[PDB]
Amino acid sequence: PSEDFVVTDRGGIVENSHRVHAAVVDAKGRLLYALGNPTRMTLARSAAKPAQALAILETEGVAGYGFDDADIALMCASHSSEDRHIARTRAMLSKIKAEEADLRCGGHPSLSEMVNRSWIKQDFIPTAVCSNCSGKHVGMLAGARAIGAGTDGYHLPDHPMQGRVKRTVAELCDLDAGDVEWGTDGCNLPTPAFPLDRLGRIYAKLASAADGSDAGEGQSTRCAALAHIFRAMARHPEMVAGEGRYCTMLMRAFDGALVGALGADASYAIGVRASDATRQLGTDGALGISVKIEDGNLEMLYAVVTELLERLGIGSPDVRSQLASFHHPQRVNTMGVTTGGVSFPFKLRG
Amino acid sequence: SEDFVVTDRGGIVENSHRVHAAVVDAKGRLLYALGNPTRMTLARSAAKPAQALAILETEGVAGYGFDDADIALMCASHSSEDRHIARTRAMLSKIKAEEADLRCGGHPSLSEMVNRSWIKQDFIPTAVCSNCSGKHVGMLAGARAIGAGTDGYHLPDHPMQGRVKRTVAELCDLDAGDVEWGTDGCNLPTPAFPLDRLGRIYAKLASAADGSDAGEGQSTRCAALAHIFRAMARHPEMVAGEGRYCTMLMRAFDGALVGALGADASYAIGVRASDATRQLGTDGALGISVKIEDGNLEMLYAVVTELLERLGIGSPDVRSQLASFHHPQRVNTMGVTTGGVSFPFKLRGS
Ligand SMILES: [Cl-]
Ligand SMILES: [Zn+2]
Ligand SMILES: [Zn+2]
Numbered sequence: 108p109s110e111d112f113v114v115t116d117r118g119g120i121v122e123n124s125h126r127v128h129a130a131v132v133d134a135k136g137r138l139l140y141a142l143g144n145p146t147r148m149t150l151a152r153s154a155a156k157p158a159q160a161l162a163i164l165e166t167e168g169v170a171g172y173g174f175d176d177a178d179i180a181l182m183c184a185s186h187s188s189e190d191r192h193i194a195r196t197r198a199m200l201s202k203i204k205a206e207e208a209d210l211r212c213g214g215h216p217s218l219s220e221m222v223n224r225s226w227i228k229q230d231f232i233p234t235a236v237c238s239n240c241s242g243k244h245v246g247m248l249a250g251a252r253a254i255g256a257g258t259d260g261y262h263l264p265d266h267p268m269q270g271r272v273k274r275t276v277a278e279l280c281d282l283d284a285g286d287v288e289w290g291t292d293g294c295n296l297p298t299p300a301f302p303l304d305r306l307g308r309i310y311a312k313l314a315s316a317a318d319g320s321d322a323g324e325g326q327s328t329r330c331a332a333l334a335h336i337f338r339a340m341a342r343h344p345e346m347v348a349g350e351g352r353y354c355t356m357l358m359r360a361f362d363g364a365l366v367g368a369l370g371a372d373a374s375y376a377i378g379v380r381a382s383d384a385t386r387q388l389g390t391d392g393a394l395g396i397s398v399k400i401e402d403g404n405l406e407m408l409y410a411v412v413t414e415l416l417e418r419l420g421i422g423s424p425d426v427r428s429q430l431a432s433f434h435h436p437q438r439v440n441t442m443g444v445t446t447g448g449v450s451f452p453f454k455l456r457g
Numbered sequence: 458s459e460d461f462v463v464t465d466r467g468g469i470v471e472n473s474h475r476v477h478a479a480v481v482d483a484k485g486r487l488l489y490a491l492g493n494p495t496r497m498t499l500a501r502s503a504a505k506p507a508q509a510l511a512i513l514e515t516e517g518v519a520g521y522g523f524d525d526a527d528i529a530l531m532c533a534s535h536s537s538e539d540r541h542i543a544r545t546r547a548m549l550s551k552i553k554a555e556e557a558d559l560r561c562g563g564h565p566s567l568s569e570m571v572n573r574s575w576i577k578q579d580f581i582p583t584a585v586c587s588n589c590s591g592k593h594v595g596m597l598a599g600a601r602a603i604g605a606g607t608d609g610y611h612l613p614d615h616p617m618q619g620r621v622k623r624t625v626a627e628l629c630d631l632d633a634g635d636v637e638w639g640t641d642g643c644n645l646p647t648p649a650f651p652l653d654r655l656g657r658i659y660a661k662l663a664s665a666a667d668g669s670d671a672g673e674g675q676s677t678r679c680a681a682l683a684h685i686f687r688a689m690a691r692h693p694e695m696v697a698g699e700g701r702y703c704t705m706l707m708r709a710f711d712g713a714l715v716g717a718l719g720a721d722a723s724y725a726i727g728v729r730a731s732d733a734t735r736q737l738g739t740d741g742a743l744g745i746s747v748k749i750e751d752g753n754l755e756m757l758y759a760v761v762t763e764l765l766e767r768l769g770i771g772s773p774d775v776r777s778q779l780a781s782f783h784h785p786q787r788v789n790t791m792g793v794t795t796g797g798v799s800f801p802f803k804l805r806g807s
Contacts, residue, residue, distance in 0.1 A: 115752075117499055117639035117640070117647070117649075118637075118638070118639030118640060119639075120497070120499055120637050120639050120649045121497070122499055122721050122752070123721055123722075123750065123751050123752035124750055124751065125751050148469070148470065150466055150469055150471055211791065212790060212791070213789070213790025213791045213792075214790060215790050224576050227573050227576045227577060228576060228577060228579075230577075238790065288467075288469050289467070290466035290467030290468075290469050290795060290796070291466070291467060291789060291793060291795045292789065292795070293789045293790055293795070294789070294790060295789050295790060295791040295793060298466070300466075300469045372471050372472055373472075401472065401473055401751075402472050402473065402474050402750075402751035402753060403464075403471065403472035403753070404751060404752070404753070440562070440640065440641065440642045440643070440644055441561060441562025441563060441564050441587065441642055441643060441644065442560065442561070442562045442644040443562075444640060444644060446639060446640045446641070446642070447639065
């Protein structure tokens with residue numbers, strides 16, 4: 108497993124190499140395939156957002172605000188700060204009678220180079236509603252208001268909204284509280300770390316809940332909420348990230364068969380609804396995939412995730428070809444000459 | 458040897474980066490190491506002083522009257538500031554060439570501050586803006602000086618590139634077959650060789666400067682190497698630019714060493730003999746070369762600065778000018794410190 112790498116070359120000469128870790132799990136979290144160390148203790152960063160959205164949606168009273176599926180997809184989002192994302196953030200603040208000054212996240216350069224270039228041309232200074240995490244933050248303000256906890260300090264560990272987040276994360280992971288560690292995210296919220304396979308487990312449970320809903324099975328309130336989060340992400344993938352973004356292009360290509368989301372510093376998680384491909388992989392239910400590039404390189408992350416989907420047989424060559432520019436990153440110099448490429452000397456193990 | 462620089466979020470491991478380093482004496486003998494000090498490595502722009510030597514040794518180039526700042530630009534990966542473009546143009550005029558003779562292409566500036574001003578003006582960079590433009594003018598100079606014609610000066614079959622290839626292997630003390638060649642972002646042949654030989658090149662620069670200063674008899678080659686060292690140290694803003702690590706490093710040391718970046722996170726430093734180098738157990742100059750395996754530049758500058766502190770090169774006051782690179786900021790969008798950088802590696806002798 109110490110040999111699982113993605114490697115870039117220049118004229119066949121090794122340039123950089125990147126250690127890969129991955130877990131492929133069933134709906135109960137049993138490990139089916141791995142790369143690297145599948146239990147690596149890993150900060151999930153923004154890939155935890157579906158679990159935080161579950162804590163929001165399980166907060167009594169939040170249903171009264173009338174958030175719709177696109178709002179819930181924005182809670183699940185690391186969005187590009189496109190004008191539609193900012194506008195929806197402001198519209199969600201109005202639903203809870205809050206204002207931009209109540210947010211405790213900060214502005215940052217857009218995750219999209221094209222958006223950021225427009226901002227630079229305009230001397231635009233991003234503010235709190237422009238945060239890629241702005242939907243999650245409005246959701247947590249919503250829950251704070253709904254239980255009467257006060258919006259001041261909704262982002263601090265001592266607040267009941269964060270106590271709810273912390274218990275919800277551990278429960279979805281099937282871990283004791285002491286086995287989840289906490290830091291602080293760029294958006295200024297508590298953010299969890301846990302073994303990488305458990306990030307796969309969370310997304311397997313998302314997809315499993317979607318399968319149960321679609322088949323008409325009786326569900327707990329939790330499974331119904333998980334099915335709702337899956338549906339929202341898959342129905343509004345442009346809210347989850349934006350134009351040209353991997354997460355958006357991936358979920359559009361698969362048209363409801365899976366959901367996926369990025370974690371900052373190069374983690375990724377995918378929940379796959381039961382299919383011919385999942386059955387061929389040896390399980391009778393939904394499937395979860397999680398990935399971490401040890402050194403944090405995002406370009407390599409998206410190449411590896413796409414390569415892994417091909418090796419697992421998920422989708423078809425035609426579906427996955429929508430991701431070709433991520434799968435095989437361009438290596439072209441300033442005069443248009445191809446100078447190298449990207450290779451995948453790793454081996455899936457069962 | 459498992460040597461890493463490790464970033465954390467709240468003490469939880471975020472990313473880790475494998476480090477390779479060689480510390481060599483003036484004859485290339487290995488004194489200290491991290492990782493694999495003989496890793497086959499693409500030197501990229503850190504090879505520029507060897508390419509400048511090939512230029513300066515070309516018959517007739519002396520008649521063009523290149524000065525020290527011109528030679529510093531030949532050795533540069535500059536930020537494309539207005540002064541770098543103006544010097545490139547002055548060098549083209551010295552050889553009666555024009556911008557359309559260049560065979561490098563434009564690219565987003567290596568400086569974020571420069572790139573933002575370009576984006577604001579809708580400026581599209583051209584050949585004269587290349588971070589390698591000084592090297593390219595020098596190659597055009599050599600091609601013209603021997604009557605080989607400017608057309609195709611960048612191609613492997615051109616006599617200028619034959620001179621570069623030979624000069625690189627000679628400075629490395631390697632046979633031609635032990636240097637591999639690809640194509641750079643700037644569309645020139647670019648060499649790969651064991652990482653320690655990159656340190657050997659820079660040790661030879663600093664040794665030549667020591668010998669020029671001590672008034673030793675010198676070959677034409679050692680005299681030119683001494684000139685290259687002097688030029689980089691006298692004009693470190695030409696080698697890179699405002700705010701750049703290479704510039705701030707050489708300014709802080711005020712002639713005691715030179716250093717330059719290789720794209721995809723290699724670094725090389727040539728250290729003139731000093732109380733520090735004697736304390737490390739050599740009676741001459743010293744060379745340092747570093748590669749971050751995954752290509753991360755931020756981690757490269759942190760590691761190089763930590764290495765200078767471990768090796769005792771400079772004073773605490775001198776190295777404090779590099780504090781922002783040594784321990785990069787880890788502060789979120791709300792001004793809260795969220796993490797840090799650590800150096801759990803240990804330098805081994807021999
Ligand atoms: Cl390139
Ligand atoms: Zn966040
Ligand atoms: Zn170049």
